C-alpha cells in the first residue's frame, strides 16, 4: 500500500516487514539492516543501532500488588526490599511475558506461559482477575511493543483475555528474516534461586541436539539454566576441535617446538618423546592438510568463564581416564566440577549457561557476548562470600555489555558497586498499594556498607537486641550524670567494656576519648 510505503521509507520496521510479506529485495534489506546494523564505539564494543529492552511494567491485582508501575533502566535495574515485598513476583511476571517472544521465535503461533488461576490473583482483589502489562522498545522504528498477560481466578464466570499479538508480530520478524538470511537473535534467560541444584554428570538428557542453534532457547526461562546441556555441548566442542588435523597439526607443531626447546636446554631424557611427536606430526602432515568455528566458540566461552568467575583460571576437557571429564583450575588446583564448592559451582553454572546461549545466538558478531537480550537474576549474592559480592555486577556487565540485567539483592556490599539511578526500593511500610517504585535518596556507588545498611536497607549498623551494643551509650550518660568524673558505677561499666571488647577495641578507645573530653570540659567549667 502507499501508506505502508511512506511509513517504511520513514523507518518504521513493521511497515517494511508487511511490504516484504505481501510482495512474496528493497524491503527485506530494510528489515535485515534494521536488525543487524550497528557500530563499534570508542571502547571497542559493538553497539546495535536499534536497542531492545523492557521499558515499563505494570501489575494489577497480581499477588501482593493492587496496582504497581515500574520504569526499568536500559542497562541495569536492581530491586531491593525486605522478604515478602514481591521482588521475586516482579521477575516472575517479566519472565512469563518473555516466554511469548521465545515461543514465537521457535514456532509460528507458539504459546508462551500463563498466570496461575490458583496463586497469581491477589487474594483480596474485589475484581477476581490479574493483569501483567509490559512495554518493550526496539529502536526508534519500533518504540512500543505492548503485551498484556491476564487471568481470572478459578471458578469466575467471566474470563479475562491476554493480549499477546504484538509479541508474536515482533517475534515473527526475527524468525522469518533469520530463515532467509542468518541474523543475530536476542537472548532471554531467568536465573532464580532454583539454580542452586546438586550437580550430576551421570544424568544425561538424550532429547534434542545440543549443537542445534535453537537449543539456545531450551528451558531458557525455566529458572535453573541447563548446566548439564553446557557440559555436553562443551565436550562436543572439544571432540570436534581435537578431530580436525590442522589445529591438531598446529597443536602438534607447538608441542614439537616446545619439546625441541627442552632437548636444546640439556634434558636428553625427553629426546625419545620428541622423536615420537615428530613422527606423529609428519604423519598428520602427510594426511591431507587444510579456521574451525568450533575452536573459536570454545575459546570465547573459556575466556568468559575465567574472566567472570574469580576462583577459576582455566577450564578444559579430559578423556584419558576413559570417561569425559570437564576439569577446572580452581585457586591454583586442578579439580573436577563436582569438587567445586556450591557457591563456585552455582555461579559458574550461571555464567557458562549464559555464555553458551549468547555464542549460539550471535554467530555474526566478532564478540558474540556483545549480543542483545534481557537476563533476570534473582538474589545475585546467593552463596557468595562478601569478597565476591564486591566484584560480581562489575564482572557481569563487563562480559555482557548489551544485555539488560534485572536483578534482586539483599546485599549492601552489592549495592555499594551500583549507581543510585539503577536501584528501585520498596517503601518501608508499603502493604501493596504503592503505585510507583523509586530510587534511594543516597548515592550508593562507592559508599560505605554501614551507611547503605542504615540509609537504604533500614537496619542498624550495631545489633539493637544485644546489651553490649548499648554499653557505650550508657557509659556516656553515667559520665555526664557525675559531672564528668569516673564514679564507682561508671568505673564498673568501663571495666566491663574493657573486659568484653578488649584493651585495643574501638569501643574502649571511644570510652577513653569520652573520659578525656569530659574531664577537660569539667576543668574548664571550674576555671570559669
Amino acid at each position: 500500500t502507499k501508506q505502508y510505503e511512506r511509513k517504511a521509507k520513514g523507518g518504521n520496521l513493521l511497515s517494511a516487514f508487511e511490504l516484504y510479506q505481501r510482495n512474496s529485495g528493497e524491503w527485506f534489506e530494510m528489515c535485515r539492516d534494521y536488525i543487524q546494523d550497528g557500530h563499534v564505539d570508542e571502547s571497542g564494543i559493538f553497539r546495535p543501532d536499534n536497542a531492545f529492552y523492557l521499558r515499563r511494567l505494570t501489575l494489577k491485582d497480581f499477588r501482593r500488588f493492587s496496582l504497581l508501575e515500574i520504569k526499568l533502566e536500559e542497562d541495569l535495574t536492581v530491586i531491593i526490599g525486605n522478604n515478602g515485598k514481591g521482588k521475586t513476583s516482579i521477575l516472575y511476571a517479566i519472565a512469563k511475558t518473555l516466554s511469548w517472544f521465545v515461543a514465537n521465535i521457535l514456532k509460528e503461533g507458539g504459546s508462551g506461559q500463563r498466570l496461575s488461576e490458583m496463586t497469581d490473583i491477589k487474594n483480596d482483589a474485589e475484581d477476581r482477575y490479574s493483569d501483567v502489562s509490559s512495554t518493550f522498545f526496539f529502536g526508534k522504528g519500533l518504540k512500543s511493543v505492548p503485551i498484556r498477560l491476564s487471568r481470572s481466578a478459578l471458578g469466575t464466570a467471566e474470563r479475562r483475555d491476554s493480549e499477546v499479538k504484538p509479541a508474536k508480530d515482533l517475534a515473527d520478524i526475527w524468525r522469518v528474516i533469520n530463515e532467509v538470511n542468518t541474523i543475530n537473535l536476542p537472548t532471554f534467560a531467568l536465573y532464580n534461586v532454583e539454580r542452586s541444584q546438586p550437580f550430576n554428570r551421570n544424568i544425561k538428557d538424550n532429547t534434542g541436539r545440543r549443537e542445534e542453534r535453537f537449543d539456545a532457547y531450551s528451558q531458557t526461562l525455566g529458572g535453573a539454566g541447563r548446566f548439564d546441556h553446557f557440559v555436553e555441548w562443551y565436550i562436543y566442542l572439544h571432540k570436534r576441535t581435537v578431530s580436525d588435523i590442522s589445529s591438531s597439526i598446529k597443536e602438534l607443531e607447538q608441542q614439537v617446538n616446545d619439546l625441541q626447546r627442552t632437548v636444546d636446554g640439556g634434558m636428553v631424557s625427553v629426546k625419545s618423546l620428541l622423536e615420537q611427536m615428530k613422527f606423529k606430526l609428519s604423519e598428520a602432515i602427510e594426511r591431507n592438510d587444510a579456521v574451525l568455528t568450533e575452536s573459536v566458540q570454545k575459546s570465547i566461552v573459556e575466556k568468559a568463564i575465567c574472566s567472570v568467575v574469580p576462583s577459576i583460571s582455566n577450564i578444559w576437557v579430559e578423556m584419558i581416564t576413559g570417561s569425559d571429564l570437564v576439569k577446572v583450575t580452581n585457586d591454583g588446583h586442578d579439580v573436577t566440577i563436582d569438587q567445586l564448592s556450591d557457591g563456585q559451582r552455582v555461579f559458574l553454572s550461571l555464567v557458562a549457561d549464559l555464555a553458551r546461549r549468547m555464542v549460539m545466538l550471535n554467530p555474526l558478531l566478532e564478540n558474540p557476548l556483545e549480543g542483545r537480550g534481557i537476563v533476570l537474576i534473582d538474589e545475585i549474592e546467593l552463596h557468595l562470600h562478601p569478597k565476591w559480592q564486591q566484584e560480581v555486577i562489575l564482572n557481569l556487565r563487563s562480559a555482557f555489555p548489551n544485555i539488560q540485567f534485572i536483578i534482586t539483592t539483599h546485599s549492601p556490599i552489592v549495592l555499594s558497586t551500583i549507581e543510585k539511578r539503577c536501584i528501585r526500593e520498596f517503601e518501608p511500610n508499603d502493604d501493596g498499594d504503592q503505585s510507583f517504585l523509586d530510587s534511594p535518596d543516597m548515592q550508593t556507588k562507592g559508599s560505605e556498607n554501614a551507611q547503605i545498611l542504615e540509609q537504604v536497607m533500614n537496619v542498624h549498623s550495631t545489633p539493637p537486641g544485644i546489651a553490649e551494643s548499648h554499653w557505650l551509650g550508657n557509659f556516656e550518660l553515667l559520665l555526664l550524670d557525675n559531672s564528668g568524673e569516673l564514679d564507682n558505677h561508671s568505673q564498673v561499666l568501663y571495666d566491663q567494656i574493657k573486659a568484653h571488647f578488649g584493651i585495643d577495641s574501638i569501643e574502649l578507645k571511644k570510652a577513653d576519648s569520652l573520659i578525656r573530653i569530659n574531664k577537660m570540659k569539667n576543668k574548664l567549667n571550674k576555671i570559669r
Binding site: 502507499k2 505494570t58 496496582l67 493483569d131
Partner: protein, 159 residues
C-alpha cells in the same frame, strides 16, 4: 463505532461522567477534555495529576460498575521535558500547536519532489490534502513553505 447514532449515544452516556470529573478537576486547577475514549488532563501545578487515575477508577466503578474501565497500559504522564501530543497534534515548548518536526520535514520532502515533477498523481493528491490539514493546525507553516518554495509553486500545487 460504525453506526451514525453511536457517537451521539456514547457522548450522552458519558455526560454525567464528564460533569463530575470536570467539576473535580476545576477545583484543583486541572484542565480536562474528552475525545471519544481518549481523556486528557493538563496543569501548571506539579504533583497534582498523579491522583487523577485513582479518581477516575472510583468514578467509573460508581457510574458504570465493571462495564467501563480504564486501560491502564494506555495511561501516560508527560511534561515539557518530553514529547506532548493531544489527538495527533504536537504541543511544542512555545505552548503552540504544531504538526511535529517529522511530519513537517516529510511535507517539505513531498513539495521538493513536486518541484522536480517527481510526484505521481496519487502522492500529489495526498500532498494537497495534507497541506489543507496543515493550514488548519499550523497556518504559519504554510506561510513558511510559501517563503521557502515560491508562492507561485505553492499556488500551482494548490490549484
Amino acid at each position: 463505532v460504525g453506526a451514525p447514532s453511536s457517537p451521539v449515544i456514547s457522548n450522552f452516556c458519558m455526560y454525567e461522567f464528564d460533569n463530575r470529573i470536570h467539576a473535580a478537576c476545576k477545583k484543583v486547577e486541572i484542565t480536562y477534555t474528552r475525545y471519544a475514549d481518549d481523556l486528557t488532563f493538563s496543569s501548571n501545578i506539579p504533583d497534582v495529576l498523579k491522583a487523577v487515575p485513582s479518581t477516575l477508577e472510583v468514578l467509573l466503578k460508581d457510574l458504570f460498575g465493571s462495564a467501563l474501565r480504564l486501560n491502564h497500559s494506555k495511561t501516560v504522564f508527560s511534561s515539557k521535558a518530553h514529547n506532548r501530543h493531544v489527538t495527533g497534534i504536537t504541543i511544542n515548548n512555545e505552548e503552540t500547536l504544531s504538526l511535529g518536526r517529522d511530519r513537517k520535514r516529510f511535507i517539505k520532502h513531498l513539495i521538493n519532489q513536486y518541484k522536480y515533477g517527481l510526484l505521481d498523481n496519487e502522492d500529489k493528491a495526498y500532498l494537497i490534502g495534507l497541506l489543507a490539514f496543515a493550514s488548519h493546525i499550523e497556518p504559519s507553516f504554510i506561510t513558511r513553505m510559501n517563503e521557502k518554495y515560491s508562492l507561485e509553486l505553492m499556488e500551482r500545487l494548490r490549484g
